[PDB]
Structure formats: structure tokens, C-alpha cells
Design an enzyme around this catalytic site. Structure first.
Site: not given
Ligand SMILES: NC(=O)c1ccc[n+]([C@@H]2O[C@H](COP(=O)([O-])OP(=O)(O)OC[C@H]3O[C@@H](n4cnc5c(N)ncnc54)[C@H](O)[C@@H]3O)[C@@H](O)[C@H]2O)c1
Ligand SMILES: NC(=O)c1ccc[n+]([C@@H]2O[C@H](COP(=O)([O-])OP(=O)(O)OC[C@H]3O[C@@H](n4cnc5c(N)ncnc54)[C@H](O)[C@@H]3O)[C@@H](O)[C@H]2O)c1
Ligand SMILES: NC(=O)c1ccc[n+]([C@@H]2O[C@H](COP(=O)([O-])OP(=O)(O)OC[C@H]3O[C@@H](n4cnc5c(N)ncnc54)[C@H](O)[C@@H]3O)[C@@H](O)[C@H]2O)c1
Ligand SMILES: NC(=O)c1ccc[n+]([C@@H]2O[C@H](COP(=O)([O-])OP(=O)(O)OC[C@H]3O[C@@H](n4cnc5c(N)ncnc54)[C@H](O)[C@@H]3O)[C@@H](O)[C@H]2O)c1
Ligand SMILES: NC(=O)c1ccc[n+]([C@@H]2O[C@H](COP(=O)([O-])OP(=O)(O)OC[C@H]3O[C@@H](n4cnc5c(N)ncnc54)[C@H](O)[C@@H]3O)[C@@H](O)[C@H]2O)c1
Ligand SMILES: NC(=O)c1ccc[n+]([C@@H]2O[C@H](COP(=O)([O-])OP(=O)(O)OC[C@H]3O[C@@H](n4cnc5c(N)ncnc54)[C@H](O)[C@@H]3O)[C@@H](O)[C@H]2O)c1
Lengths: 258, 258, 258, 259, 259, 258
Positions: D38, D189, D152, D55-56, D82
Site C-alpha cells: 500500500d 469502507t 470510475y 505506488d501501483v 485490489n
Molecule cells: N467499497 C466498495 O463499495 C467497492 C465497490 C466496488 C469495488 N470496489 C473496489 O475494491 C477495491 C478495494 O477498495 P476499498 O473499498 O477497500 O477502498 P479503500 O480506499 O479502503 O482501499 C483502497 C486502497 O487502495 C490504496 N491505493 C490507492 N491508490 C494507490 C496507489 N496509487 N498505490 C497503492 N495503493 C493505492 C489506498 O491506499 C487504499 O488503502 C478497489 O479496487 C475498489 O475500487 C470497492
């Protein structure tokens, strides 16, 4: 019935295989057609105007908006038909090749629709059925394929952007319908290049085995002709399609459904 | 020109809300229309012939085939528009209620298409684009819904039967296109009954809250009008749709795509 | 993790190719398994009970309910795995062949789920995640195919019934999850018969060309093994799948997505 | 447990986020070796054998992940993409740079990361008959559109289709690498929280309570998902139990996409 | 289904009192959204999603409740008029202004509050087939008279009859709003405590122990009620399970009124 | 919440219109239900046991006591729901018709409660809130009506017996709550017969004028549904009603209060 009387239409990539047939079909349904492509000049049968237009250029789109604004005061139909394809091995594809495909196939729709939005809002007031935005996706936006990662990804992006804009423009009360079109294998230079590049990559033994395989994957048993795309685009642009927005409009000879 | 010149068309459930608009639209595109429904007589604007026809009856379909055979020698377009809906609690729905809905919505297409197949093969020889079979599915054939188990199941069956017949008729060289149509909420007696029965079941608080909820589920923000189904069916029946088979043709105001 | 501790499971068609592997997999995850099939007796490895059970018989289902009621007082998981296939020319397929396929593949789920609903409601109280109903559809429920009209239509009906019941049981507060499973080509007697009958019909030149064609349509490049269905069904039946209802659970080696 | 990750070396990005932390716990509980990554320089990620700042969007960041996996294990069996972001915006007020930022995090992450780890995934492909497993986080937003989520939704549809293409390509080239997309519904989340708040500020929803109730009611199951409810699905896709699953849309959405 | 308040927006007055706090807990436990109101400028009411300072005698106070409900939810599904006072007095020493003070809190509260929230209750009536639910706190004192309780008993009989009239009127006008009166017996709260002590000071009772024993023995069940024993009844009346209950005397009195 | 966890419940007349809904509602709140009626067998959804039981028979009640004693060792809830109605001219009603109505509606409660009293005392030890006896009276036990002399008299007797037993069981320290339930017009075969017999007697011009008159007497403006009795009975049987004894629990759509 299905006509485009008093419809001011912008068609991008209008000098291409499908583009030329879209312009002919739309003129035949009585549309006023502004045709655009990369060439400084072109003889596009059925075009009332031709403009040199790089769909990646905000300045190019502003020149389209200026001509439409000055001559007609609205845009009723916007057909985003400009696109490119590449065939590549994922592991040998630099990020810049994905970005180039994205810029032509997706950023074109974002920039173009933003620049023409004031004129499309006027289209929305001119017809109860709405202004109509037609985005060229692909069966490649519905079904994956080996060696088409960059192209398929961009065409799925086009498909989803269409759904989002259809929903957003309706929620904001603009009366602008947005739909994605999904052609199967259509007999144009683009399909030709994809087949040849598939052979040189070693995806197919020969260009004859590739062609026969692609034809057989279509239940109808053949490639489409560019003219077979025209009626569908005329329908989506017309008031006959007043209840059609956010839709996947498929013209693929059954490819996606088997 | 999207038109039905020299098209002999059979339309079932032709006295219903959508059916009457299909007949008008198809006549306006110059089709010869054989309209059929359950009533012994009916005044269907645009019909060249009306026949009493229970779509669950092989004998009823043979009478349609006899009139078309005797008067024209072919069928170019077959629109399976006849259908019913019920709204029920699954646990209180006897198997015979599922069977009744299946008989009208699915068995109609199986019996009717088998009986008219010789005449559709002649349609296939009369136009390069092919004979056209249009099956009325629903957004209910794409998306499920509480209390519509019997209806939705039958409309998903209609959708898949359309794909299988499109693929099979093309593989056998009959030149018969088969597509499914998926209307959203269309303002007809059928939608009226579904909404009222939803209230009596206690699925919706009131008929006003039900109506507003259903309207808001459509991105376009309203019910469709029966007339908004006409252009789509004319397109699918025409030579303009020569590359369209096995397809889900959606006219749902964006319902399925959000 | 993913386990079926204190899960009372009913599995139909349990003596078949996939069914035997489902029983083994579910026992290995610590489920109590009531296995059922057409044979008066069978040695089903991992079954705690075997019952003779025609899934088309209300009386047969009541006997399953009686054993579960008497011995356990609930059903936590119901796997509708019983099914048949035919390969036929549509125009030579009597309505009774569609009905026979519908009775085994769809009416089984309607009758069985209605009869076991009181016991599934008890499953719904026994686990926060809910009772789990797993309906065996097919890639044939997602994509059409020539000569499989009766089979594909029934499997699309299974898929849509799953969505409707998932939504309805949640709206009524029963805490019963319902999902459809969509296998690709799995190496069982059923796939064997379909391929052989395809040859006899003249749909395929030889049984070797049929096999190679079907294998190549799967991106993964081969048939599935029955054991490769087990993990997916265990997952859907477990509390790990507490947020999974109305879903198309695909195990097809990529078939449907290219 | 008969669905398990014994001898599975797993990389999980965005591992400090709401879903990511539960993925790491679930994968450790199935006996995986987990490299969690992360943006934070350090994090206490329960179940992680290693944490890396990553950083991804950075090729150099991915090379550092590859170097640690190469040195310590010689393969990667499972790669869970993720990490992602969301924005909520009016299309006509969204600069092209906002689309590009969302694309860079949500899509370019998968392209760069999968290219850099491909040699290690090929070794995963030789270590298990079932194959190496790449799990791409798409969304119900990659299946169904929504007003104000253009940037998005478009990125998540791109993730979905890239998954299908890589599944098909890796199989055609004989690498024995499975690739699948995961489509969560509304999961409880911080990301879902921000989307709902920004929907209110935009005037898409009258209040944050009406927005929340509307989103919950769109799910047939009648509630948001919990992050823990994503864990089992990702464990299944990463395991040999999913040996016949590639190119697939794996939906965990409480029925959202199907009504 | 069962007895629950899922997606029920509830207003509870006198919510910081002995019964009121238990009503809020019980209604939250059945999944209601609860707007709690009382005289204090702030209070910590377990289960409340919102607390408002609210004098139930003030039209302006009620308009502030309507504004919060309108802005945040767009409806009221349940309105519990629980705010009330008691006095114990000799009739001949009770000025008309003491009757009026008791009337203003116990009866005018229901008239003003129901008029101000009526548009929002009509929306409740459209949101649930069972209807919006108005629950008016009467008393066994609204059913049976008592020496020295003239002002209190008179006000609680007025509450009872107003409930019947509004139930009948709202049904005749098609608003789908149920109205019922609740009749607690002796419930162990500060209010019962004060009534007993003031009975002693007036010289009605020798001692606080003889008063308590006398009141307990009047209840066939043989004891006073606990505030928590009011909660289930109010949850029932507010729920769709009570769709055929309007105009009703809902008694929770340990048998007091029936012997 | 309001629930019946570990509650052993006896429900008489359980195969009738209200009785079936009481059993469903009480099972949904997690009660163990012994359902009884006059048929030798019945399929009562939510019943753990069905017994043939004439509520006028001491021997029938002893069989209920024996099953509860053997299987559970207590009764927590006793719902006296069995009853009959007659509609007659007083002067043409023999004393034996009053006695028949009294035997079913009142003697049932006296005999049943005496025979189950040892088991009810055990329930009073099992829950702080007490065992719960729920007696079905009527609005006819509160308000008189022409031609309902025998029925109304019996239902007033049921009401008063409830008050006396509530007071007596509390005075003796048994911890058994007793309450009367007073339904308005509920849509069941019993209300149907009463309305038809009202027409034959010449109390009402037609069955439609009778129905409309009876509906209009209810402030809520309609008949009740049997399901609308369920929550009230669940509440009275639960620990949530620990301070409710001797009470008239009215579910009458406002009938008695205008
Ligand atoms: N929560 C929802 O309702 C939901 C719905 C559909 C899809 N998703 C997807 O599920 C996955 C998890 O999301 P979440 O709900 O846990 O959100 P979150 O924001 O809690 O976690 C996402 C993580 O990505 C990390 N991140 C962001 N940009 C980054 C970068 N450049 N390099 C490295 N790390 C980076 C952030 O630091 C964060 O910890 C994501 O792909 C999100 O789009 C979530
Ligand atoms: N031919 C097929 O099989 C097929 C299948 C699926 C989708 N499509 C889509 O149909 C559309 C038309 O394709 P076609 O077959 O006619 O291809 P084409 O290449 O014949 O026509 C495309 C045109 O786009 C123009 N163009 C490219 N980049 C441009 C830019 N930056 N600015 C302006 N113009 C630009 C080209 O100059 C060309 O004339 C494309 O969007 C393509 O992706 C075609
Ligand atoms: N109205 C909607 O919202 C909606 C939505 C999706 C699908 N559809 C489908 O569109 C089609 C047309 O529906 P509509 O809205 O006009 O409904 P409608 O009820 O107005 O028309 C249907 C017609 O079918 C006829 N019919 C019924 N059973 C028949 C039988 N056994 N034999 C012959 N005719 C028979 C009826 O008499 C009626 O005229 C139907 O298949 C319906 O399911 C409509
Ligand atoms: N094998 C494949 O390629 C494939 C592909 C798609 C889906 N499926 C589905 O998976 C399931 C399992 O099929 P399989 O491959 O194990 O086939 P199988 O024929 O090996 O097993 C099917 C079982 O169903 C039983 N059965 C049939 N009719 C019955 C009836 N009336 N009552 C009770 N039992 C009955 C048969 O005895 C047999 O044991 C089926 O629903 C099938 O349609 C399999
Ligand atoms: N406790 C009993 O024995 C008993 C018996 C029957 C009826 N009741 C009724 O139950 C209800 C609750 O009583 P309780 O015993 O909890 O009493 P309580 O005094 O504990 O609570 C009543 C609440 O009403 C509030 N209140 C008073 N005047 C107000 C005003 N003008 N605006 C707003 N709030 C105001 C008080 O501050 C208090 O919080 C009352 O209506 C009471 O009459 C109680
Ligand atoms: N339905 C109304 O309008 C209404 C109004 C007021 C009160 N009630 C009371 O509600 C209760 C349920 O009535 P319902 O409307 O369901 O009527 P119902 O006739 O459907 O049910 C009554 C049941 O009691 C059974 N019963 C009759 N005599 C019996 C006996 N000797 N032994 C055992 N069982 C016997 C019958 O078999 C029947 O199943 C009754 O006590 C009735 O008097 C009904």
C-alpha cells in the site's frame, strides 16, 4: 416512420469504411451531415460539409462546434465513429500503446461530447425524442480475445462511458440519448489489418485459415458489409428511438450470443 | 430508407397495447399485415387481415399458415407479440400457473415457428436480408424481480430460444433472422394490472409509490409509450437489419444498464 | 475460511458425473449430505443418506422433506443438480420434448424449493449467512447454440428463476440465498451423449472433430473435470458466500467471455 | 479446509484498505504466504508475512515487489490487484486529467504490475497444475453505469475486459495463468462513504441518509456488504479449486447487477 | 414478515424520561431511525440518531422537528407523543391555570405536533401499506378516575378520545395514518415517585411504603411495571404487524383497569 | 425484539383461516408449535406437530398434554383460537344451539386450561414474563348485534373468563398471563358464512350491500386479513408482554371505538 428530417449530424472518421456508409445512409434519411476525418480534404458522398479533424484535439472539436454553431445553432446527432485497433502480445505492449488506443477511441468521446454539449442541449430542445449520441464500441467491448488487450479494453470503456452519459444527461434534464454500437467483423481496411497482424504475430497459420475461423465464429456465417451498419445508426439518431438510451445496440451477425 | 415493401407480416396479440402500434408502424412502412388475437373479430388499424388465433393452438396456427399460403405464398416477418403476465408469491404459485404463462409466452413461439417454417423459408428466398422472426421477451428476461418468478422465467426462455433459432436457421442455410425484443415498462393495460396486483400483494405500499418507483428505475425517467416499440420492430423486420440475428434488441429507457 | 460445518445439504442427481464429486467435496467440507437420484439404491461416496427421488414428483420431494424434518429439523443447502439434455433439429422437435426437458430441469426447482421452503426458512435461522439454494444452469443458459434449443431454453429458465427467487426470498425476510451455476463442457456421460447424438444428427462430421471444436471454444483449451465443479458449489453453500445471491456463478474455462 | 492456499505466494495491493485487510486475513487463514503492499511507508497488516510501500502506478515500485518475491520465494502463485480509487463528478465539469488519474490507478496498475510480475507468475504456472491466479478488482460499476460515476465506471469496465483478454492470451501462450475480475457491490469502507458524501455535495441525493437508504434498497439482499464478505471469493479464485475458472466475472454484489 | 421497524423514521417526545429512554432503545433494536426530543438543550439518549431540544407546547419547537425530518428523510413513519406531566391536588384548591398547564403538555402537544407533522405523516402513509403510526400516551387514568388526580385523569381521557377521532378522520380522508392510545398502569419512573411523595405531603397517605403497597396491590399482577415493559407494545403499534389496529386503547397495566 | 425463542405453543383451530396465519407467525418468531384441529390430518405450515383435537373433549386435551409433557415438559403459550358462529332469530333459536356455541367457544377454554394447567405452571417457571394464555373473543364480545345473540353472548363469556383467570393465576403465584383477543371482521370462511346467513335471514338486501355495510362500519374502511392477527398474538405470547394480563387486545380496524 424512421427519418432524420431537420437533424444536424456530426460523423467522425467519416472517410473510413463504415463512416462513408453512415454519411450516405444519414443523408438518404434527409439529415444535414458534417463529416470529419484526419485528411485535409475528402470527397464524402452525402456530406454537406467536410472538416479536417483530429478527434484527440480539443482545438479540432472547437472548429467543428464553431461551424455547427454559425450555420445551424444546434447538433441533433453526434456519431463517434473514429477509432483505431492494434494486435499485440501483452508482454511486448508498452503502456504508451494502450494510451494511444485510449486517446483515439475513448478521449475522443470525452473531449468531443464536452465541446459539443451546449449544441447538443439545443438539439435536446429541438426534438421531443432528444439529441442522440452514438458511440462506436465493438463486439470486442462485450467479449475478450487473445492479442486484442489494448483494443478490447478501450471498446469496453466506450460501452460503459455510453451507459454513464445516458444516465447522467437524463438525470440533469438535457434530453440527450447516448447509446453504444457493437459491430461484429465488418469488411473494412481495419478488419484486413487485424487479420494480417494476427498472421505475423503467429496467432493464425495463414490469412485464409484466420478469415475462415473469424467468418465461422459469426452464426450468420460471413463478415458484415459496411452498408449493414447504416440502418442501425439512422434508427438510433431518429425520434423512432426516443425510448432507447444507455443501450448496447449490437450488429454482429450473432457473434456475441453463441 | 428503412421500409417493409413487399413484406408479408404476421403479428400476434395484435389487439393489445403494443400490438396495435406494431401494426400501424408496419403498415406505415408498406408491409402487408396479418393481425391475430383471441377476440373473434377486431378493428386493427393498418391490418389487411384479422384472424381469431389462440397462440397456444396448433390448429389456430395452421389457419394462419393456410391464409398466408393461399393469399401470398410466403411470410417475410413473424412478430410473436402475444403474451401474459402474473404477479404472485412464489410459495403460493401452483406449477399450473408457471405452465399457463409458459404456454402463452414460449410454446406460442415453438408451435407458431414450426407451423410457419415452410412459409418463412419462402420469405428467406424472397429477400437477400432474410425472413425476420421477432420474439417479444422483456427486460424481465434480462433482470429478475421479486414476485415475477413465472413471468421473468418465461421471458428468459423466450430470449434464449431466439438465440438458438437464430444460430440453427443460419447453420441450416434457411436465411431466417431471429431476434428477441426487450421492452422496459410500457404504458399498456398489462403494466397497469402488474402494478395493481403488486399493491394487492403488498409488494408496493400504494399504486402512486409503485408508479414513481418503476419510473425512477428507468434512467430516461418515465414509462415508455406503445408507439415507441414500433420503429425497433420495423427495423428488425427490414433488410436494413440483414446483419442482425440472435440479438437482444432493448427498448427499455436504460432500465437494464444501471 | 470456507467450510460446511453443521450444514444439512440435499443434492439431487447425486449419482451422476458432477453429482458424485459435489457429494465428495461437500462431505470433505463437513456437510451432512442427503444424496438423491432415480436408482432405487446407489453407493454415493460421502452421502450420509441415499433416497430414490424423481425430481419431477411432488411425492418424491415430500419424502426428502420428511427424512430431513425427522432427522435434522432444517435444510441449510439445496443443490438442484439433476438435469437432462437432448440434441435435436428444432423443426423435428415435438412440444413434448421441450416439456420433458422443462419438467426435469426447471419444474424440479419449482416443486423441490416449494416443498423444502419451510425447512430452508429454518436453515435461514440456523446461519447468519442464510440457507443456500444452488441451481445447475449451463453456459447454455448464457449463450445459444444450434440444435440445443430445448436444453438452452430450459437452462436460461433455471438462470432467471434463480434471480427471481433470490430477490423474492430476501424481500420476504427468509434469509435464503439463491444462485445459478454455469458449467462449461464437463467430461461426464452427459457431454459424451450430446457429442455422439450431434454426430448421428449430422451436426458434426465425426466425434473427434466435435470434441476438438468444443475444446478449442474454451479459452483454457480443454473440457472441465467433474471435480472442478466441487469447490464452487462448496463456496456458494458456505457462510463465506453470505453476500452472494441472484448471481451467475460461472465455471466454464472462459467459454462465455470470448 | 479443502479450498486452501498451501504453498501459495500471494501479492495483495491496497492491502491497508477496508477490503485489502480482510483479503490478507482470509488468505493467511487459508495458509498463503502474503506480500501486502500500500501507499503508507509502514502498516500493521494482520496476516502479512511482508509489508512494502508500493505506488501501483510506479514501474519502479512494482520492480521492488518483484525483487522481494524473486529473492525470498522464486515465484508468485497469486496476484490480487485490489488498489483503486473513485471520484464522483459532473461529466461536463470533469477535466480529461481526472479520467486519466482514475485510469492510471485502476487500470495502468494492472498493466504495469502484471508485465513486471509475468516472469514470476510463469513460475507460479509451473508450480501448480491449476495455474497462477491473477484477481483484478473491477466493480458492479464495471457491469452497470450510473450518473456522476463516468470516470470510475469506465475504468472498472476497462479492468473487467482486460481480465478477459489476459485470461485468453495467457492460456493461448501456454503460461498456465488464470485471470478473473471481481465485482463487489456496495461494501462498507471509507471509499463507499466518500462516494455517498460527494453524491450529496454534487446534489445527486437530497441528504446522506436518503442516498444510503436508496443504495441499500438497490441491493436485493437489502444492505451494504461487509469487507470480510469479499475474502472467501478471492481465496476461492486464488486456489486450485478454481482450476477451471478464467476470464470470469466473479460477482459479490448482494444481487445488485441481476435486478 | 415479523415485528420490525426497518426504514421507519420515528419521532419520540419526552425521550429523556423513564419510559421515553426505553422506547428509544426498543425502537432502535427493531431498526428504526429515531429522532428523540425533550426539554434539555442536550441529552445522551441511547439509540437516538438525532436529539433535538423541544418544548411540545411550542409550534416553533415542532416546526424545528419537521424541518430536520423533512431535510434528512422526507417523511415521518411513526410519531410517539410520550411527553407528559402529572399533578396531585385537591380539586377545590386547583386553579383553572393548573388544569390548563396539564392540558397544554398532555393534549395540546398532540394537536400542535400532529398538525405540524401531518404533511410528513401523509408521506409515511405512502411509504408503507400498513400506514404511518401515531402513538399517544394516555394512562389507566384516562380509563378510570381517581381522587386528587382530576387534572391529570381529565387530560389523559382527552388524549384517549382525541386518538379515536384522529384514527377515524385520517382513515375517512384516505391519509393511511393509524392513531392509537397507550394506557400504562403504575410504571417505576420519577413521575410515579413524585405522585406518591406529593400524595403523602397532601395527607392522602400515611407513608411512602403504605402508598407503594396499596398501588402495587391494585394491580392484579401484584407489582408496578418497569419502563422496559412499555417498549414492545409501542414497537408493535409502530410496525406493519399492527396494520389492522387504529382508534384502539392499547393497555399495558398489569390488569389494573379490568378488576 | 419481540420473539418466542424456546416457547412451546399450543394453537387450536389451527387449520382455519386465522389459525394457519397464527402458526406461520409464531414459527417465524421461533416458537415450537403444536397445531390442533378436527381433521385427522392437515399440512399446517410452521407446525412441528399436528394432532386431531376436538376442543370440547377432555380426552382430546389429555392427548395434547401427553405429547407436550413427553416431548418438552412444559407449555409456554396456549392459543384458544377454535370457535364457531351461528346467525339466527333469537325466538327461533333453541336452547341447544346456545349450548352448542358455548361448548365450542367457552367450555374449550375451561377444559383445555384445566388439563394444561400443570404444564402452564412449568412455563411460568421457564420464563420470568410467564406462560401466556390467549383467548379468541371478538368485537362481538364488546358490542352486541341483531341476530348474533348466541355468538356474542359466548364471546363476552370468553372475554370475562380471561379477566378472571388472569387475576386468579396471579393471586395464586402461578406466573400465567391470560388475555382476550378481539378481532373485527376478518376475511375467512367464518365471516363469509355469517354474511350469507345474514342475507338468507333477510337482515341484508344482498351479499354485496351486506359486505359494503360491514366494511364501512370499520373506520379503517375494509375487512382485516387473517395475517393481520399474527403479530398481536406473537406479542401477547412473548416476554415483551410481561406487564399485559387480563387485557382486551383489540385488532378491529377501529370498529368498537366509533
Ligand atoms: N467499497 C466498495 O463499495 C467497492 C465497490 C466496488 C469495488 N470496489 C473496489 O475494491 C477495491 C478495494 O477498495 P476499498 O473499498 O477497500 O477502498 P479503500 O480506499 O479502503 O482501499 C483502497 C486502497 O487502495 C490504496 N491505493 C490507492 N491508490 C494507490 C496507489 N496509487 N498505490 C497503492 N495503493 C493505492 C489506498 O491506499 C487504499 O488503502 C478497489 O479496487 C475498489 O475500487 C470497492
Ligand atoms: N471493421 C470492423 O470489423 C469493426 C468491428 C468493431 C468495431 N468497429 C469500429 O467501427 C469504427 C469504424 O471502423 P472502420 O471499420 O470503418 O475503420 P476505418 O479505419 O476504415 O475507419 C476509421 C476512420 O477513423 C479515422 N481516424 C483514426 N484516428 C483518427 C483521429 N485521431 N482523428 C480523426 N479521425 C481518425 C481514420 O482516418 C479512418 O478513416 C471504429 O470505431 C472501429 O473501432 C469496426
Ligand atoms: N407492457 C409492458 O410493460 C411490457 C414489458 C415487457 C414485455 N412486454 C411484452 O410485450 C408484448 C405485448 O404486451 P402489451 O403490453 O401490449 O400487453 P397487452 O395485454 O396490451 O397485449 C397482449 C395481447 O396478447 C393477447 N393474448 C393473450 N393470450 C393470448 C393467446 N393465448 N392467444 C392469442 N393472443 C393472446 C391479449 O389478448 C392481448 O391483446 C407481450 O409479450 C408482453 O409480455 C410488455
Ligand atoms: N456435463 C456438462 O458438460 C454440463 C454442462 C452444463 C451444465 N451441466 C449440468 O450439470 C448437472 C450435472 O450433469 P452431469 O454432467 O453430472 O450429467 P449426468 O447425466 O452425469 O448426471 C445427471 C443426473 O441427473 C439424474 N436425473 C435425470 N433425470 C432425473 C429425474 N427425473 N429425477 C432424478 N434424477 C434425475 C441422472 O440419473 C443423473 O444421475 C446437470 O444439471 C447438467 O445439465 C453439465
Ligand atoms: N410512570 C407512570 O406510572 C405512568 C403511568 C401512565 C402514564 N404514563 C405516561 O407515560 C409518559 C412518560 O412518562 P414517564 O413516567 O416516563 O415520565 P417522566 O416524567 O419520566 O418523563 C416524561 C418526559 O416528558 C418531558 N416533558 C415534560 N414536559 C415537556 C414539555 N413541555 N416538552 C417536552 N418534554 C416535556 C419530561 O421532561 C420527561 O422527560 C407520560 O405521558 C406519562 O403521563 C406514565
Ligand atoms: N373471522 C372473523 O371475522 C372473526 C371475528 C371475531 C373473532 N373471530 C374468532 O377467531 C377465531 C378463528 O376464526 P376463523 O375466522 O379463523 O374461522 P375458521 O372457521 O376458519 O377457523 C376456526 C377453526 O376452529 C375449528 N373448530 C371448530 N370447532 C372445533 C372443535 N369442536 N374442536 C376443534 N376445532 C374446532 C374449525 O375446524 C376451524 O378450523 C375463532 O375463535 C372466531 O370465533 C373471528
Amino acid at each position: 416512420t424512421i427519418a432524420l428530417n431537420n437533424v444536424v449530424a456530426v460523423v467522425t472518421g467519416a472517410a473510413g469504411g463504415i463512416g462513408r456508409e453512415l454519411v450516405k445512409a444519414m443523408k438518404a434519411a434527409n439529415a444535414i451531415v458534417i463529416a470529419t476525418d484526419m485528411a485535409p480534404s475528402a470527397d464524402v458522398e452525402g456530406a454537406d460539409h467536410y472538416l479536417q479533424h483530429d478527434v484527440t484535439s480539443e482545438a479540432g472539436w472547437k472548429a467543428v462546434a464553431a461551424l455547427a454553431q454559425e450555420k445551424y445553432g444546434r447538433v441533433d446527432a453526434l456519431v463517434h465513429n473514429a477509432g483505431i485497433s492494434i494486435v499485440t502480445k501483452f508482454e511486448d505492449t508498452p503502456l504508451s500503446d494502450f494510451h494511444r488506443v485510449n486517446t483515439v477511441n475513448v478521449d475522443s468521446i470525452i473531449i468531443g461530447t464536452q465541446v459539443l454539449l451546449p449544441l447538443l442541449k439545443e438539439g435536446g430542445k429541438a426534438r421531443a425524442g432528444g439529441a442522440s449520441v452514438v458511440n462506436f464500441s465493438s463486439v470486442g467491448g462485450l467479449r475478450g480475445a487473445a492479442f486484442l488487450a489494448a483494443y478490447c479494453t478501450s471498446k469496453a470503456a466506450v460501452k460503459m462511458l455510453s451507459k454513464c452519459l445516458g444516465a447522467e444527461f437524463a438525470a440533469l434534464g438535457y434530453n440527450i440519448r447516448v447509446n453504444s454500437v457493437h459491430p461484429g467483423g465488418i469488411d473494412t481496411p481495419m478488419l484486413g489489418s487485424i487479420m494480417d497482424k494476427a498472421v505475423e504475430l503467429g496467432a493464425a497459420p495463414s490469412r485464409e485459415v484466420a478469415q475462415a475461423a473469424m467468418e465461422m465464429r459469426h452464426p450468420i456465417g460471413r463478415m458484415g458489409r459496411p452498408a449493414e451498419m447504416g440502418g442501425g445508426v439512422v434508427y438510433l439518431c431518429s425520434d423512432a428511438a426516443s425510448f432507447v438510451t444507455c443501450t448496447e445496440f449490437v450488429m454482429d451477425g450473432g457473434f456475441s450470443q453463441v
